[model samples]
Target chain A: LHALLRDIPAPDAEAMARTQQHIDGLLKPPGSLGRLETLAVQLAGMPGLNGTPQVGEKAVLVMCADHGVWDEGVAVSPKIVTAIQAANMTRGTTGVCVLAAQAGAKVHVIDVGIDAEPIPGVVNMRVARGCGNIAVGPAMSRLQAEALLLEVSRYTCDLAQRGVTLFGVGELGMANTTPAAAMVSVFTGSDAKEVVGIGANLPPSRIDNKVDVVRRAIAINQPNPRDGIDVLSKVGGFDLVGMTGVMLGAARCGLPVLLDGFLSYSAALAACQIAPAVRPYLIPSHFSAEKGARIALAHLSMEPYLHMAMRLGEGSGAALAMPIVEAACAMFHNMGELAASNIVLP
Target chain B: LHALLRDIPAPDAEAMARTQQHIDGLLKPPGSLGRLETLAVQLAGMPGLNGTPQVGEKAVLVMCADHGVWDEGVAVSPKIVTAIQAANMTRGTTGVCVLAAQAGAKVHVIDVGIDAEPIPGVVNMRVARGCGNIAVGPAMSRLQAEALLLEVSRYTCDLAQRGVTLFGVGELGMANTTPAAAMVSVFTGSDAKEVVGIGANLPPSRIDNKVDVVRRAIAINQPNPRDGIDVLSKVGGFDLVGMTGVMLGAARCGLPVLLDGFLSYSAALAACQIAPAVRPYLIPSHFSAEKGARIALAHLSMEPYLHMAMRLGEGSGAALAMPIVEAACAMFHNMGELAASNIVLP
Candidate 1:
């Protein structure tokens, strides 16, 4: 962990300056591309990315797990749905798979803690069958949380080394929002109600129960916000911890990480808390419909470029956003200068 | 014009119902995909798109014209920049061209009223060198406004016939937002202060002048909100009229029309007013950084899926959104049903 933190470096400043200047000088109106111009500059600055940034090689790490909190009825879906959906992802017929296909991105299903037997195609990194019932007690031990984070980090670094330029964190878990909301509340110092959202569209009356579950979990465990491992052990699930590893690994190797919805935001906050250097490599993809989204975004100090009210957490939003990222990259690398295009500037 | 208004048919009701049910029955959680789900359902309902929607064949009609209001100092770019960038599209080096290439969409640069010699590669359909200054007098004769609308409609219809399944409206006109603001103000009953935006990043001091120009155009021309021709003739430009024609034509032939930004919103508003049936086919791509975007969206009763504060108008926003559209289409066609996934329901 110390070595990963030490290796994490900020983006190349000179390339960023050059890219912004190039974008401004493009034949299009200055400052016209808006967030796209900024996104291109951000990519150009990432470590290892210089004059030309490539967004072609992309993969979404779908961390699948079953939450122990599922027994508390926080989610609307059955717990076994986690294993089913994770396995279904292997068939390339799930939400992330379908959307990622459109963006030319690979969907890698990782079984970090699904409470089921070994799935044939999923990348195995299971820390346990599932987490503890967070509504009653701590979700996992600190050692297990740290170990899972390190494990996924190693796997993700391998992915980056193998030529993936961008990685998006996705997850398949039931009652997952409970643990995520608890962790978000810890890091953001927000109220449980502020962070709790309807996972798979829980009924309005039941949202109260979900919120209660988060508050109880947080109050009982009292997770330390500064220590990502403590937060993960106390209130977070395997999905959250595994996603945190992806961010840490992606940033250490200079790959930009795309965040999906609320659960991903919880993972990002934890990752950023653990290693502030990872923040630079983070590119938000959607404004999640979850109530906790804005507060989480406020903590990160970054807004998503896409805002389609997507609540789908299978990295669908992130994958769907690759086109805009591709557009920004192409704009920076291909557009001609205003002077070269012979445009008369006012 | 009467024929266009008459021929614009509403989306098929049975097809829409079937598509919605198909989406609901997919393996992913219901409503998790949010707007993408709705977008696919919307496309499925289109007259010719009964099922298995195809976003593969697409085009962004980049309408290029010189706004006579350029003399009003309403924009940050020089008037000649319009012709230059439009011609640059012919070389596939402009903003829209590069971005459109990523989506496999065609960039059709149509010169409706560029104030320059005809370029070799840009399509020739100029109604005049430019429209008359709206602040000083009517933008174009009613006959010319009607004629230009019909002309682009014919062209766009030809595109639909030639296998373009989706059409996006984009424009390049110096001070284009000035006339668009005037038209939006007339239709939405909004003040110039509400609709005027800093076109191409006009300075703070100059924004007041842009607003003044819009007000002056509206007060002097007195364009009737109910009459599309009166509005176009009095306070709209060739690019605006040409874009309106594309929306109308795309709707007439059952092709979904993607809108770029504020200027496209003005054109869409006019197209909808001309033929209310055109509204269903209009799919907004981005929430423009322009100040009046929200009000314009309110009038249109449609929300854009993308929100990156994009002000680059060459239909880049619309083109960038094609990936999401493609995702939705693939999801609708490919995702397995929940029952087939073998997940235990709660």
Candidate 2:
């Protein structure tokens, strides 16, 4: 993590100067774009961009990993379903691609680890073929988890350097939210019930058991600032580590990392815990009914842009709200207030 | 009515070809522009142009009138509210102009009738100071209604010639929806219980009583088909007749009218009922909470382009959806399909 932060570039001074001048021109009551205005200004400051860039090309980074906690029936479906979904995502048989296409965005499937070998098209960045079943011990060793985070960091930085700018963070792991919920409860010092949700839609009895399992797992993981990597090593899946890497890479390269629904939020919380600097590149795209996401976004002080009563975690919300984001950028560029009305600035 | 239709130019062959080609190229799947596609086609066919003409200019025609049914105590606000709202609309204190600026649409306020003289600075083209109390008898003579309709026809035709290609219909009248609800209930053989909403948030008891009053009014002022003039004369307020005329004007002039919410829907129902040919020029902007609106659009086999949960009667829906309409047109003109690829279509 220390090495990754060292590689992150500083915001361009020239771009920041130009962005302020352009902003001085937009006509209106002044300061009217509100939160959107701030977003544009900050984006201008980042990546050495003088203006909002066209979103004609974009990519989604979907990280996949398996959590062994499902051995307790923590998720309604078996843990193998994580691999099934990752396969579906890669094959474009799922709604995620439909959403990506609708948003005029591209997708990259990254497989870290799941029980089964991925389909041919799926990109494998696996640290292990499968994680250790969590019924008895932690998901993976500290060294293996750290390696996964490094791999994620490498993946995102490569995409950023290629100018494949807009990045969406998503995850596919069925029983993963249990670990995320546990993380949330630990971080916020909230009750398991407060962070618990219908993760994988388990029955009440199963959900209770899942919550109990998360509590026990949290006790076992024993996360502390001095050993953040150790906590993820003990309780986090490869997906979590990979997303943390994606966040780090985006912050490192000064690209926006739009966080998708619940699972992504969980990953974001872990990422923030690892490195607070990433908050600058993070944009909350939507709120999931999942309590864990709410806690995470609120904890970070970022507003979720869209509210469609969604609980689905296929990166759909980020895609749906892309139009609004692009529109906000366009209005900043085109709408008169600057030279047309020409107010001199300090 | 016959003379208005007779005076309008018929579509030349080139117009039909252009309209079809435009729809085929409009941004989504060929038919996805939905009612908007039909409207664009209708406009093309009317103008006898081979390609889509620019909707580069816009005009908003607000037809104002007063209904005689106000005596029934059905609405919470008095008849004075309509005249006040009209004043507000013209002075930019309320409604029309508030939305007009957002839409880049112009407002042409024509006073069909109000209980009192026009508000200062308001455009006045009063047919009568007000209509007769219709719960007792007919609102206007058939001849008077026809004259009002003719004026609307002339305005639309003149605007079209001036390159004001898009028209959005609005209303300014108190107790107007009472007549509309009556017309809806009578036309569908549905009762007021199903079709009526609390106009001005009137008491439920009063609304119930108003429904009965409307049913009685419909029974007495049964719409006549032989002469469009007679139907307006027997049951319509001045603005209702003018709005009907505006619909005809749009149809005759080959301009499409984006039908506004509720009261405008009532006027649209009247126009199509009188002249089925005009139905093609209308675009349902939204499904209004006004139950009559649903019935009217259904009767015309029209689907709304927006569903904002709005029932505000300021042509607000039409103004709000104008951007979407413009987007649809842009798709038709600017967006080349994957089939066309990089080279421009011949």
Question: What TM-score, over all chains together, does every model reach?
Answer: 0.98, 0.55
Report the C-alpha lDDT of model 2 over B221-337, residue by residue, as the tens digit. Answer: 776544455555765678777778888998887677888877776677778777777776777766675656667677767767544445546665676556545644543454334
Estimate every model's Cα lDDT from 0 to 1: 0.86, 0.67
Relative to the real complex, the DockQ score for model 2 comes to: 0.04
The list of candidate 1 runs beyond 4 A from truth reads: A344-346, B344-346
Assess each model's interface with DockQ, reporting 2 decimals per model.
Answer: 0.77, 0.04
Q: What DockQ does candidate 1 have relative to the true complex?
A: 0.77
| RMSD (Å) per prediction | 1.4, 12.3
Model 2 lDDT tens row, A93-212: 444565566567788888888768766778889877666655467788888877778878888878766767778877777677787776667666778888877665556766777777
Q: Put down candidate 1 lDDT per residue, A300-330, tens digits, no spaces.
A: 9988887788887888888877777788888
